[PDB]
């Protein structure tokens, strides 16, 4: 309860950690720790009745967030781990169920059958992109196919639980916590050309309430980099 890191502090009370490993350290690298290990709270999204889902690309959502956005442009390479806190706050009269998963290397498919999606439509800079519950048209040039029952990757949406996941059920649970190590082939990669993780939030059983209650339940995502090291002189 009431953990602190750097100059930021959140309040907690079960944590699922990666593929069984904890994030740890390894020309020559430098390791900065006093100015990157803090909780960058992304701003809150709203969960309405006919909502579909959200996704963030992970070393892209912190590209403008303070000093971590400066070390992405100054240093060429780097490798980090992450620690994700998700918590939505509803009363005892709401109902629903989320799925918080963290997909590594989530390559998405374009709407047009021949092209590839552009940069502005894969990742919103510190802003959540949205799935849809209908199809995306074929006639538009280059946009991400966001049919939520195929999860944008051409896969079954039910089988997405093989990745490290955690259920948020508003009857009994309220929050979720994930710890993800660095999963890549090369031991140190670029941070602009590549997005090695993807955090997805999908509502399976949709929100429902009576007449009178507040018609939206906000979600809060809080990310903190762990054991980061860059490469340069």
């Amino acid at each position: 309860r009431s953990i602190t890191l750097g100059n930021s502090t959140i309040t907690t009370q079960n944590v699922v950690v990666g593929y069984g490993v904890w994030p740890e350290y390894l020309d020559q690298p430098t390791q900065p720790d006093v100015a990157t290990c803090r909780f960058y709270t992304l701003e809150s999204v709203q969960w309405m009745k006919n909502s579909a889902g959200w996704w963030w690309k992970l070393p892209d959502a912190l590209s403008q967030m303070g000093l971590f956005g400066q070390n992405m442009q100054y240093h060429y390479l780097g490798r980090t781990g992450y620690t994700i806190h998700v918590q939505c706050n509803a009363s005892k009269f709401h109902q629903g169920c989320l799925l918080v998963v963290c997909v590594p290397e989530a390559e998405m498919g374009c709407s047009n059958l021949n092209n590839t999606p552009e940069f502005s439509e894969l990742s919103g800079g510190d802003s959540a992109r949205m799935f849809t519950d209908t199809q995306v048209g074929e006639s538009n040039a280059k946009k991400v196919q966001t049919a939520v029952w195929n999860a944008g990757m051409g896969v079954g949406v039910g089988n997405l639980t093989i990745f490290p996941h955690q259920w948020i059920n508003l009857r009994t649970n309220n929050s979720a916590t994930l710890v993800m190590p660095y999963i890549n082939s090369v031991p140190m990669d670029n941070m602009f050309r590549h997005n090695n993780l993807t955090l997805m939030i999908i509502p399976f059983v949709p929100l429902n309430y009576s007449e009178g209650s507040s018609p939206y339940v906000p979600i809060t995502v809080t990310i903190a980099p762990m054991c980061a090291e860059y490469n340069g002189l």
Binding site: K92, F93, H94, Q95, G96, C97, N169, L170, R171, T172, F204, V205
Partner: peptide
């Protein structure tokens, strides 16, 4: 199985 309903 899992009951994804209200708490009351």
């Amino acid at each position: 199985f899992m009951f994804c309903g209200s708490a009351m």
